[PDB]
């Protein structure tokens, strides 16, 4: 034999898989280098043939029970070839699922909203609307963009999401899984190691344990940002409440970095910037790659082969030809590694070059491993390994040692504080969002959240985990979480959490091995052969052993750890604790931006009617909203002599309870940011209370 026949099967499969995959890589690479129509069909047929080969190889792997396998490598390869995927799903159901996924992607990509005073000017998401959210300092414009995008996208994506979750749950249950969430979490699952096991359910506990430690630093950062946002939007943010969702410099609040221009500690003194020195020296887009290669060689890590340097497309043509130049590392195989990018003269391009160089080095480190095992230990290792190189190379010490940044420069701690705060706005501001989103998705898949309460639960979490409050109430017709790119395209989101933890664990381990003076934020690992050897000790393993064993070979731990992150951000934590003596650190989950102007209504049907009382449902809510709109119309006509067309969608209702009590407020017909003050609503209700009461058969006490 069984072992001999399994080895023969694997060898004969790999013997073809190499060249099929290799040709598919040429097709994709040739498409990406220059956009040619004649190669599109070549890519399509090659990909279809490769997919058919994979499907047939999966079909010829069922006659191999897993209980008679002794070798571990062939066991892992057979398991990686054993998953059915969507095959077990019925043909009609499979077609329905594919159609719904394509519809979801198309709606997200080509959905547009429009101005309320110029319907002949409509903006997509990534151009225009993203710039409106990232650059505008106007409360009204940002609120309009937020609410308008959420309205259409949620309304269109809700039923599709419901059918998609039902179908995915059914397919996952058909594959001996509890739900889809278990299938997603199964990436970190490892078994049969007797000393390194990791259950699927332990991931949730580990994530909660890490977040409980990360909470206080985020609380201090949140309080500091809320204090600094008062001067930009006065009379809009409560000193004890949460933050409104639309003021966070981003459409969804995934990153807080766009607030750096409003929350800089010392704006009069800029941080380090020598991008003009590279311009003065007339550095073409070729020296940076050589410098990166030299830096990688210094640690003793293997160097670049001449095959890579032979194929160089990094210089942007700039002609009439338009092609995507997103930085990527290509791993076509059989000693063929490349990087495709548009190279300019800037700091960010320099760091991205280092990031891609690290990606390529990690990718070719495990080339000797079998083809099916040519990948990272899990989903989070690759990006962390690629990123820590750039993180170590971005320090000013490396810049001074490389030739730039002349030694006659006395660094000040204000620049260090600015750098640490800028890094924090990106690193620490995104952990609560990732944790909350993955938690909500897991409990939606697992069935804990009823389909009736989805929206409710979502916003509750944002008021208690992230500390962010919506500016307008959202009923059950919306699908705000589906507005994200990752949720509507069926992608996993926990890799962004685990990678953020692993990168700092690796940085701390490397600094401790290199015997740095103190690894606060200025640690560098250049010219350290032992550090490179330690990194290579883990780089070359690939997937041949559990990721826990790989972690133990570097940091000597079996689980995610948060202490290195806190150690990295300690100086900023001390500064923030010093700066928040007078501010109230924390937030309260009761204040709302619209709560001041709301009016509460309580209804007692049983007292007024006793028997024969009707049942109260959403149709009665519609009638109540229509009556309130009629009352406001009448008041505005009969007193202010204005013809304003209030509708039943301008009456915003919140906090519905089985007592039949709720809050409501009224906005201008087409302006969402404009809220009618409470005094006018009081006057209108006083004027039309008799009609309001008699329309429902209640009398002034019920």
């Amino acid at each position: 034999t069984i072992e001999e026949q399994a080895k023969t099967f694997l060898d004969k499969f790999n013997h073809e898989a190499e060249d099929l995959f290799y040709q598919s890589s040429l097709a994709s690479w040739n498409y990406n280098t220059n956009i040619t129509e004649e190669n599109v069909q070549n890519m399509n047929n090659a990909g279809d043939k490769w997919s058919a080969f994979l499907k047939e190889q999966s079909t010829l792997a069922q006659m191999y029970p897993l209980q008679e396998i002794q070798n571990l490598t062939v066991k892992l390869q057979l398991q990686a070839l054993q998953q059915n995927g969507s095959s077990v799903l019925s043909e009609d159901k499979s077609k329905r699922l594919n159609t719904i996924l394509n519809t979801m992607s198309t709606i997200y990509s080509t959905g547009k909203v429009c101005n309320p005073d110029n319907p002949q000017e409509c903006l997509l998401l990534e151009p225009g609307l993203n710039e409106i959210m990232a650059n505008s300092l106007d409360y009204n414009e940002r609120l309009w963009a937020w609410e308008s995008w959420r309205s259409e996208v949620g309304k269109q994506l809700r039923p599709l999401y419901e059918e998609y979750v039902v179908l995915k749950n059914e397919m996952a249950r058909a594959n001996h899984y509890e739900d889809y969430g278990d299938y997603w979490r199964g990436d970190y699952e490892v078994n049969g190691v007797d000393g390194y096991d990791y259950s699927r359910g332990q991931l949730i506990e580990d994530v909660e344990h890490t977040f409980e430690e990360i909470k206080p630093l985020y609380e201090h950062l949140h309080a500091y940002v809320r204090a600094k946002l008062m001067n930009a939007y006065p009379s809009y943010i409560s000193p004890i409440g949460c933050l409104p969702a639309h003021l966070l410099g981003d459409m969804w609040g995934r990153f807080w970095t766009n607030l750096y221009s409003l929350t800089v500690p010392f704006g009069q003194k800029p941080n380090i910037d020598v991008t003009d020195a590279m311009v003065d020296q007339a550095w073409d887009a070729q020296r940076i790659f050589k410098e990166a290669e030299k830096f990688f060689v210094s640690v003793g890590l293997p160097n670049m082969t001449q095959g890579f340097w032979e194929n160089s497309m990094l210089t942007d043509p700039g002609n009439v030809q338009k092609a995507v130049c997103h930085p990527t590392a290509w791993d076509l195989g059989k000693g063929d590694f490349r990087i495709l990018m548009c190279t300019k003269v800037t700091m960010d391009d320099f760091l991205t070059a280092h990031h891609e160089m690290g990606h390529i080095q990690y990718d070719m480190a495990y080339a000797a491993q079998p083809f099916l095992l040519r990948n990272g230990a899990n989903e989070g290792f690759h990006e962390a390994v690629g990123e820590i190189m750039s993180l170590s190379a971005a320090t000013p010490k490396h810049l001074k040692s490389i030739g730039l940044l002349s030694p006659d420069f006395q660094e000040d701690n204000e620049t260090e504080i600015n750098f640490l705060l800028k890094q924090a706005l990106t690193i620490v501001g995104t952990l609560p969002f990732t944790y909350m989103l993955e938690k909500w998705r897991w409990m939606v898949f697992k069935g804990e959240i009823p389909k009736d309460q989805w929206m409710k639960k979502w916003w509750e979490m944002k008021r208690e985990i992230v500390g962010v409050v919506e500016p307008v109430p959202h009923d059950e017709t919306y699908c705000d979480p589906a507005s994200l790119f990752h949720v509507s395209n069926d992608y996993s989101f926990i890799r962004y959490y685990t990678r953020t933890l692993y990168q700092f664990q690796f940085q701390e381990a490397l600094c401790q091995a290199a015997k740095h003076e103190g690894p606060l934020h200025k640690c560098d690992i250049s010219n350290s052969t032992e550090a490179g050897q330690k990194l290579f000790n883990m780089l070359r393993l690939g997937k041949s052993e559990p990721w826990t064993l790989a972690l133990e070979n570097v940091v000597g731990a079996k689980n995610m750890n948060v202490r290195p992150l806190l150690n990295y951000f300690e100086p900023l934590f001390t500064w923030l604790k010093d700066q928040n003596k007078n501010s109230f650190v924390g937030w309260s989950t009761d204040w709302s931006p619209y709560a001041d102007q709301s009016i509460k209504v309580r209804i007692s049907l049983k007292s007024a009617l006793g028997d024969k009382a009707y049942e109260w449902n959403d149709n009665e809510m519609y009638l109540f909203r229509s009556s309130v709109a009629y009352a406001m119309r009448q008041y505005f006509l009969k007193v202010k002599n204005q013809m304003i067309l209030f509708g039943e969608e301008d009456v915003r209702v919140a906090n519905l309870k089985p007592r039949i009590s709720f809050n409501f407020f009224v906005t201008a017909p087409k302006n969402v940011s404009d809220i009618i003050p409470r005094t006018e609503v009081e006057k209108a209700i006083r004027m039309s209370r008799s009609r309001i009461n008699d329309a429902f058969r209640l009398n002034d006490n019920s």
Binding site: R602, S604, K606, P658, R659
Partner: protein, 50 residues
Amino acid sequence: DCFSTNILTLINGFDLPEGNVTQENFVDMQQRCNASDPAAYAQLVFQTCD
């Protein structure tokens, strides 16, 4: 009348359905609401008419 007022004040304070806390099941529900969350039942003032 006093007992009806006592029921009504709890109903208003805790937003319970009208017709759930009756005369026969007032004490058990009254203590259940208190056991649910202190510091909100405290502000409720009840009358001890008998």
